[PDB]
Amino acid sequence: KSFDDQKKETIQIIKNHFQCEDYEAEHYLYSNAFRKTYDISCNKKDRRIKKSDFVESINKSKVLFNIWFYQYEGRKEYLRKLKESFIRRSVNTSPYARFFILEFQDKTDIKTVKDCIYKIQSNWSNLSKRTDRPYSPFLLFHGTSDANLYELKNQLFNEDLIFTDGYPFKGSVFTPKMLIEGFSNKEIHFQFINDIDDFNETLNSINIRKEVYQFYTENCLDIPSQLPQVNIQVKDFADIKEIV
Amino acid sequence: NDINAEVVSVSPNKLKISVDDLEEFKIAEEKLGVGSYLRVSDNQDVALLAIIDNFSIEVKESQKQKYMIEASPIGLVKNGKFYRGGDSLALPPKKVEPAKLDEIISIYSDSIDINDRFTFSSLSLNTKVSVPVNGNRFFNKHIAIVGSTGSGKSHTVAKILQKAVDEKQEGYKGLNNSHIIIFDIHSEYENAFPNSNVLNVDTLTLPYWLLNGDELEELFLDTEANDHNQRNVFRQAITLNKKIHFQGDPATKEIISFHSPYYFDINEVINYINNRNNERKNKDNEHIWSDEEGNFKFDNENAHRLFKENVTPDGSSAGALNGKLLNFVDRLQSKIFDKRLDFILGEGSKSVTFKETLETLISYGKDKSNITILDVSGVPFEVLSICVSLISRLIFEFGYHSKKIKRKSNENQDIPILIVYEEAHKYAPKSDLSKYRTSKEAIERIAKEGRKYGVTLLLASQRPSEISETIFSQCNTFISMRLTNPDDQNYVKRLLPDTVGDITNLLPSLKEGEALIMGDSISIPSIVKIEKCTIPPSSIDIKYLDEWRKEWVDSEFDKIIEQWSKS
Amino acid sequence: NDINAEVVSVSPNKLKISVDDLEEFKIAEEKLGVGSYLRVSDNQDVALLAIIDNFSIEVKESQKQKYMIEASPIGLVKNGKFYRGGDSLALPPKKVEPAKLDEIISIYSDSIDINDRFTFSSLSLNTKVSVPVNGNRFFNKHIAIVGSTGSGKSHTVAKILQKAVDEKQEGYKGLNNSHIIIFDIHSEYENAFPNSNVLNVDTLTLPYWLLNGDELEELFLDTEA
Amino acid sequence: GVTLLLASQRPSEISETIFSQCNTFISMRLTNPDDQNYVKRLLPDTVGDITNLLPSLKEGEALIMGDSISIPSIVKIEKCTIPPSSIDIKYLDEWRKEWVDSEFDKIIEQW
Amino acid sequence: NDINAEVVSVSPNKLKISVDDLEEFKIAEEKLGVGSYLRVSDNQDVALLAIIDNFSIEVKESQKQKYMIEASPIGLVKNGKFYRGGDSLALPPKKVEPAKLDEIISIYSDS
């Protein structure tokens, strides 16, 4: 019944409320519920509590950051709790159209973003010469200027990491077919989706199962709701690498 | 990239991995060995861990080099936790790299919790990976430590007992509850454990009356001269003598049988059988004898007075056993008067009792020690199986009376005993010869029923091929040093527990110190490197080329001859 | 689709199944393993049943993946009923998909009447499929339960008797007509049956006069003298 | 109407005239090759690699075979919610204790 | 180069030596027989030592002579000192020479 002892008792309360599974009760639902509890207590103006809008606000299809949950067990414990929950992997990863929407801000260095791309591409692709169904992850970045976005694009291309954005030449219109044909191309490491408008055009061109792994810090993109999504909020961009 | 390997074929219990690019060239030397581990996955999260079995690096003049590693899946790692199981599928192609350090540690550390880990060795191909065994299951189940001579098998045995002796929990500075009995025939562990109780023939005193019916017959009966009269009189001479010397509670005096462990005077037993050689009889077929008290018949009420030599028989005709036991009497005096059997048939066995004998065997006397080394080098070989079976049955029955007292008392103050049988094929041979049958069934009793009474065994042998399969299979945990004889290798391979594909083919190729443990106590059958002994077992071997190179020894010949004649 | 497998070779007691697409990777992990059961048919009502004995997934740079499965027919499913006998012929090609849960259950339960099933275990390779024995024929014929140390031999014995006491006609509460006598030498089944009558030497009163002539001469008489 | 269940840790020491009167056989792991040769010879049916699987049967894995079960199959016995009193001694747990002095003379006096 | 031999295949405990020239025509008689010792190295300092187990000299009418030597490694020599337990991986191809008099002595002398 203490701060470090009671907290397990809320899980079965959330579990029978939504008739939900165990892994999204403790990690997705209760962690979001505790965060909005702080937001009505951290402010010193309105400490009164409502219930009608509180129940549906936490089911926003996002795993918001919890600063106390990050604190009393450390960085390594908190990032692996997100590793087994929404990044459930297998030895036989299927060729699905995986989308990685990452919030790239102007305060983020290029090298830290390149380390995350090099881990996403290595873990979510199988570009073997022997496979008949190769796959490559789709990479989308937002929240950055175009000039800073092209610097990451150019440095990635120098270290032999071949990608397509649907723009095979200068002055080209967006060609979604090059993104799909690079998914089955073993010499194309990943796909660099340029922006939101090019992102939403890409989903209409694929017929196979699609997954979305959004990792952000402040703002989140309103992805269409029918496909599976993973929305995880972190502190910095370096936390994303140890989650993918 | 350092290595570019890939699964190109999948079998139900085999993987075929082709290394396409090899650039660093130390991955092949260190991380692509036969006993090495590989992770098979498209990601770093969940990997199918596999051990290598074979490889064939073919090169050609114009063709590309093909490496073709053949491996077998041993289990499944997931989020740092390793699940065993060979029935896990990795659909080819899958990226293959050598297993990282944290995954190899997760093979062994995760299966056994902290309070149950017993570490005495580290992995041979990765010295940073400690290999703990389930220390409860390591010793509660029986151990077989084999490996050819010169491979350091006795190094492996003593290192295990040294770690078990130093297995002290925090709270005390005294000795722990380790109880190790070593049947040391090569006299190696005297210098391995200096704080122990080493017992040679000049120090050990084993009572002859603690032998059961099988061991008493084996010491004194002639198998070729299998006389029913010699067999049966030996029971009546001993069982009646055990009744007389009993002076405690009279309720168990008449319950004494031949196998009951009470004291009898064997000098009186010889005098009884020698008197039965002097058997006379009358018209009524009744043997009449004369002593200082007077004339008496031969019945159970006068059977006790033939135990002294001052008996003069009275009669006319030939008795039932007149002269048929003189083969027995002269064989009995060749044993009790044998100076090499002074430790089992001398005057020391007359005065010692049951309690001091058992205090000597598990070092529970005045000088308590965790390890009791029984130096059986001086024991004659024709009585060596008897002496082993006497101690083996006494310790096992001590463990029986330990448990069933505590079964009806519900106390956790327990005495678990390990018996190290070095050169175990001597004691429990494959052959069904009758001379070693006493020690074969005593070890088999400990091998089968012994783990429930807290008496478990450790079979150490450089040549396992004469160890009987009824006893060697009871050793759930099996440790193998370098084994160079194919007869020993094929005996091991067919007696083996549930292993992995080609780990037992490394037995002839083991270097110095490398071992191989399987069984329920370890997570994975693996080639480890045993921790080097800071106090190794060294036997005092007489150095012939050192002594033969010396000048002709002239003084030390008459000292040998005059000591032979007791002068 | 998720599985595209078909028979490319028929022996008298061996099938050779070639997997062509295998789009869903989840099927291959648990349903295409060795010992798993495949159904072999061109229709959805009459099918062969084949247990996988071996497989070999061959992959190469230029050609497609060669996933080849060795299976052996065990029986026949006609309209949900399983009939044993692997002598039925299925001329190739016959499309192959993994057997359903009710089909594998029908392998081990359709030879037994529903009133006559006594279940104490499930299949080792598929824990969702129970393996009943014929109930009546289990106990009136003698049973030998043998195993090594720590293998659960005492657990297997205790579980079987536990289902025997739990074997009840659905008409009553209380004790059923099960009668089990255990000769416990190692004192292990007192815990496993807490509602039983454990009889050690403190409470047992065996009358000595019910012994015959031979047993009275071992309780009282020494045979050596 | 009086039948028997032969539960033995060591099947090779039961009488052949008694062990063969059984019809249903439940064979768990058997490490002793004397046990395996006795069981395989007296067994009513056979399974494909019974020589190699009898050592290799895991915990709780048996082989139900005989008159009551038509297909001799490898099963997993249902987990005991009330398990029997297991016989084992956690040696390292006992050996880590300090030297037991009191419970030694009790064993000698009752012998 | 009187002898030009080369490893073409490497097993855990077996090597395939391909003699390419064999100009001397006496090296094969004494130093490439079964039981002779070979020098598997690409440098003069550190060398694998392998004993010849079996050879085969196939000769055809038009093609080249394929002298194939099957040898098994026994140990390692590092600047004149022999270390037993030969399992160090010699990545093919490698120059193969008969072991000189000093290495073969070092197999038996220094131990």
Coordinates of C-alpha atoms in Angstrom, one line a residue, chain B residues 120-384:
Chain B
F120 CA 33.7 -25.1 -11.2
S121 CA 34.5 -24.5 -14.9
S122 CA 34.2 -21.9 -17.8
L123 CA 33.4 -22.4 -21.4
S124 CA 36.4 -23.6 -23.5
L125 CA 35.6 -21.6 -26.6
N126 CA 34.6 -18.5 -24.6
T127 CA 36.6 -18.1 -21.4
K128 CA 34.5 -15.2 -20.2
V129 CA 31.4 -17.5 -20.0
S130 CA 31.2 -19.2 -16.6
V131 CA 29.3 -22.5 -16.9
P132 CA 27.3 -23.2 -13.7
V133 CA 25.5 -26.4 -13.0
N134 CA 22.5 -27.0 -10.8
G135 CA 24.5 -27.7 -7.7
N136 CA 21.6 -29.5 -6.0
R137 CA 21.0 -31.6 -9.1
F138 CA 24.8 -32.0 -9.6
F139 CA 25.3 -34.1 -6.5
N140 CA 21.9 -35.4 -5.7
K141 CA 22.1 -37.3 -9.0
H142 CA 25.2 -39.4 -9.5
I143 CA 28.3 -38.2 -11.3
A144 CA 30.5 -40.1 -13.8
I145 CA 33.8 -38.3 -14.4
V146 CA 35.7 -40.2 -17.2
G147 CA 38.6 -39.5 -19.5
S148 CA 41.8 -41.2 -20.5
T149 CA 45.0 -41.1 -18.4
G150 CA 47.0 -37.9 -18.7
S151 CA 44.0 -35.8 -19.6
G152 CA 43.7 -34.5 -16.0
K153 CA 40.6 -36.5 -14.9
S154 CA 41.9 -36.5 -11.3
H155 CA 42.3 -32.7 -11.7
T156 CA 38.6 -32.4 -12.6
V157 CA 37.5 -34.6 -9.7
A158 CA 39.4 -32.7 -7.0
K159 CA 38.4 -29.3 -8.3
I160 CA 34.8 -30.3 -8.0
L161 CA 35.3 -31.4 -4.4
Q162 CA 37.4 -28.3 -3.6
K163 CA 34.6 -26.1 -4.7
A164 CA 32.1 -28.2 -2.8
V165 CA 34.3 -27.9 0.3
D166 CA 34.5 -24.1 -0.1
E167 CA 30.7 -24.0 -0.7
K168 CA 30.0 -22.0 2.5
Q169 CA 27.1 -19.7 2.9
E170 CA 27.7 -16.4 4.8
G171 CA 27.4 -16.6 8.6
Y172 CA 30.1 -19.0 9.9
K173 CA 33.8 -19.6 9.9
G174 CA 33.8 -23.3 10.6
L175 CA 33.5 -26.2 8.2
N176 CA 30.4 -26.7 6.1
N177 CA 28.3 -29.8 5.7
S178 CA 30.2 -31.3 2.8
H179 CA 30.8 -35.1 3.2
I180 CA 33.0 -36.6 0.5
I181 CA 34.5 -40.1 0.6
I182 CA 37.2 -40.9 -1.8
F183 CA 38.3 -44.5 -2.6
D184 CA 41.8 -43.4 -3.6
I185 CA 43.8 -46.3 -5.1
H186 CA 46.5 -44.3 -6.9
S187 CA 47.1 -42.2 -3.7
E188 CA 46.7 -38.8 -5.5
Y189 CA 44.3 -36.8 -3.3
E190 CA 46.5 -36.8 -0.2
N191 CA 48.3 -33.7 -1.5
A192 CA 45.1 -32.4 -3.2
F193 CA 43.3 -31.9 0.1
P194 CA 45.8 -31.2 2.9
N195 CA 43.0 -30.5 5.4
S196 CA 41.4 -33.9 5.2
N197 CA 41.6 -37.4 6.9
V198 CA 43.7 -39.8 4.8
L199 CA 43.3 -43.4 5.8
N200 CA 45.8 -46.1 4.5
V201 CA 46.0 -49.7 5.7
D202 CA 48.3 -48.6 8.6
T203 CA 45.6 -46.2 9.8
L204 CA 42.2 -47.6 8.7
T205 CA 40.7 -50.3 10.9
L206 CA 37.7 -52.0 9.3
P207 CA 36.0 -54.6 11.5
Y208 CA 35.6 -58.0 9.9
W209 CA 32.3 -58.5 11.9
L210 CA 30.7 -55.6 10.1
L211 CA 30.8 -57.6 6.9
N212 CA 27.4 -59.1 5.9
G213 CA 26.8 -62.7 4.7
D214 CA 28.0 -62.0 1.2
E215 CA 31.3 -60.3 2.1
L216 CA 32.1 -62.8 4.9
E217 CA 31.8 -65.7 2.5
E218 CA 33.8 -63.8 -0.2
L219 CA 36.7 -63.3 2.2
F220 CA 36.8 -66.9 3.6
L221 CA 35.1 -69.4 1.3
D222 CA 36.7 -71.0 -1.7
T223 CA 34.6 -70.6 -4.8
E224 CA 36.3 -73.6 -6.6
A225 CA 35.9 -75.6 -3.4
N226 CA 32.2 -74.9 -3.1
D227 CA 31.4 -77.2 -0.2
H228 CA 27.9 -77.0 1.3
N229 CA 29.3 -78.2 4.6
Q230 CA 32.0 -75.6 4.6
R231 CA 29.5 -72.9 3.6
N232 CA 26.8 -73.9 6.2
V233 CA 29.2 -74.4 9.2
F234 CA 30.6 -70.9 8.7
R235 CA 27.1 -69.5 9.3
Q236 CA 26.6 -71.5 12.5
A237 CA 30.1 -70.7 13.7
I238 CA 29.6 -66.9 13.3
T239 CA 25.9 -66.4 14.1
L240 CA 26.1 -68.3 17.4
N241 CA 29.3 -66.4 18.2
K242 CA 27.5 -63.1 17.5
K243 CA 24.9 -64.1 20.1
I244 CA 27.3 -64.7 22.9
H245 CA 29.3 -61.5 22.6
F246 CA 26.0 -59.5 22.6
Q247 CA 25.7 -58.2 26.2
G248 CA 23.1 -55.4 25.8
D249 CA 19.3 -55.8 25.5
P250 CA 18.4 -59.5 25.4
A251 CA 15.4 -58.9 23.1
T252 CA 17.5 -58.7 20.0
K253 CA 20.0 -61.4 21.0
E254 CA 18.1 -64.3 19.5
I255 CA 17.1 -62.3 16.4
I256 CA 20.8 -62.2 15.2
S257 CA 21.3 -63.8 11.8
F258 CA 24.4 -64.3 9.7
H259 CA 24.0 -60.9 8.0
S260 CA 23.4 -59.0 11.2
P261 CA 26.3 -56.6 12.1
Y262 CA 27.5 -57.5 15.6
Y263 CA 30.9 -58.5 16.9
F264 CA 32.2 -62.1 16.9
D265 CA 35.6 -63.5 17.8
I266 CA 37.0 -65.0 14.6
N267 CA 39.7 -66.8 16.6
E268 CA 36.9 -68.6 18.3
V269 CA 35.2 -69.2 15.0
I270 CA 38.4 -70.9 13.7
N271 CA 38.5 -72.9 17.0
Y272 CA 34.9 -74.0 16.4
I273 CA 35.4 -75.2 12.9
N274 CA 38.7 -76.9 13.9
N275 CA 36.8 -78.6 16.6
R276 CA 34.2 -79.7 14.1
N277 CA 37.1 -81.4 12.2
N278 CA 37.7 -83.3 15.4
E279 CA 34.1 -84.5 15.4
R280 CA 33.5 -87.9 17.0
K281 CA 30.2 -89.7 17.4
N282 CA 28.6 -92.5 19.3
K283 CA 25.9 -95.1 18.4
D284 CA 23.3 -92.4 18.7
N285 CA 25.0 -90.1 16.1
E286 CA 25.6 -87.5 18.9
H287 CA 29.0 -85.7 19.2
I288 CA 30.4 -85.9 22.7
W289 CA 33.1 -83.5 23.9
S290 CA 35.1 -83.2 27.1
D291 CA 36.4 -80.0 28.7
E292 CA 37.2 -78.8 32.2
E293 CA 33.6 -78.6 33.3
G294 CA 32.8 -82.2 32.1
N295 CA 31.4 -84.3 29.3
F296 CA 28.7 -82.8 27.1
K297 CA 26.7 -83.5 23.9
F298 CA 26.7 -81.4 20.8
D299 CA 23.5 -79.4 20.9
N300 CA 22.5 -75.7 20.7
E301 CA 22.9 -75.4 24.5
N302 CA 26.4 -76.8 24.3
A303 CA 27.3 -75.3 20.9
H304 CA 28.8 -72.2 22.7
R305 CA 31.6 -74.1 24.4
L306 CA 33.4 -75.4 21.3
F307 CA 34.7 -71.8 20.7
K308 CA 37.8 -72.4 22.9
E309 CA 40.6 -74.8 21.8
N310 CA 40.6 -76.7 25.2
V311 CA 38.1 -79.3 24.1
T312 CA 38.9 -83.0 23.8
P313 CA 36.4 -85.0 21.7
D314 CA 35.1 -88.3 23.1
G315 CA 33.7 -91.0 20.8
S316 CA 34.3 -94.1 18.8
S317 CA 33.2 -93.7 15.2
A318 CA 33.9 -91.1 12.5
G319 CA 31.8 -87.9 12.8
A320 CA 29.8 -86.2 10.1
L321 CA 32.6 -83.7 9.4
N322 CA 35.7 -85.5 10.5
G323 CA 38.3 -84.1 8.2
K324 CA 36.0 -82.4 5.7
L325 CA 36.7 -78.9 7.1
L326 CA 40.5 -79.1 7.3
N327 CA 40.5 -77.4 3.9
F328 CA 38.5 -74.7 5.5
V329 CA 40.6 -74.3 8.7
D330 CA 43.9 -74.0 6.9
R331 CA 42.3 -71.4 4.6
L332 CA 41.0 -69.4 7.6
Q333 CA 44.3 -69.2 9.3
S334 CA 45.9 -68.0 6.0
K335 CA 43.7 -64.9 6.3
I336 CA 43.6 -63.9 10.0
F337 CA 47.4 -64.4 10.3
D338 CA 48.0 -62.6 7.0
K339 CA 49.9 -59.4 7.9
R340 CA 48.5 -57.6 4.8
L341 CA 45.0 -58.2 6.3
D342 CA 46.0 -56.8 9.7
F343 CA 43.7 -53.8 9.2
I344 CA 40.6 -56.0 8.7
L345 CA 41.5 -59.1 10.7
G346 CA 44.0 -57.9 13.4
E347 CA 43.5 -57.1 17.0
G348 CA 42.5 -53.5 16.2
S349 CA 39.2 -54.8 14.7
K350 CA 38.6 -56.6 18.0
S351 CA 38.6 -53.5 20.1
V352 CA 37.0 -51.0 17.7
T353 CA 33.2 -50.6 17.7
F354 CA 30.5 -49.6 15.3
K355 CA 30.5 -45.9 16.3
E356 CA 34.2 -45.3 16.0
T357 CA 34.2 -47.2 12.7
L358 CA 31.5 -44.9 11.2
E359 CA 33.1 -41.8 12.8
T360 CA 36.3 -42.8 11.0
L361 CA 34.6 -43.3 7.6
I362 CA 32.9 -39.9 7.3
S363 CA 35.5 -38.0 9.5
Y364 CA 33.0 -37.5 12.4
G365 CA 35.6 -38.4 15.0
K366 CA 37.9 -36.1 17.0
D367 CA 39.3 -34.4 13.9
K368 CA 36.3 -33.4 11.7
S369 CA 36.9 -33.0 8.0
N370 CA 34.7 -32.6 5.0
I371 CA 36.7 -35.0 2.9
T372 CA 37.7 -38.5 4.0
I373 CA 40.3 -40.1 1.7
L374 CA 40.4 -43.9 1.9
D375 CA 43.9 -44.7 0.6
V376 CA 43.2 -48.2 -0.7
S377 CA 46.6 -48.5 -2.4
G378 CA 47.9 -50.8 0.3
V379 CA 44.8 -53.0 0.3
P380 CA 45.4 -56.4 -1.4
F381 CA 43.6 -56.6 -4.7
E382 CA 41.8 -59.9 -3.9
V383 CA 40.2 -58.2 -0.8
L384 CA 39.9 -54.7 -2.4

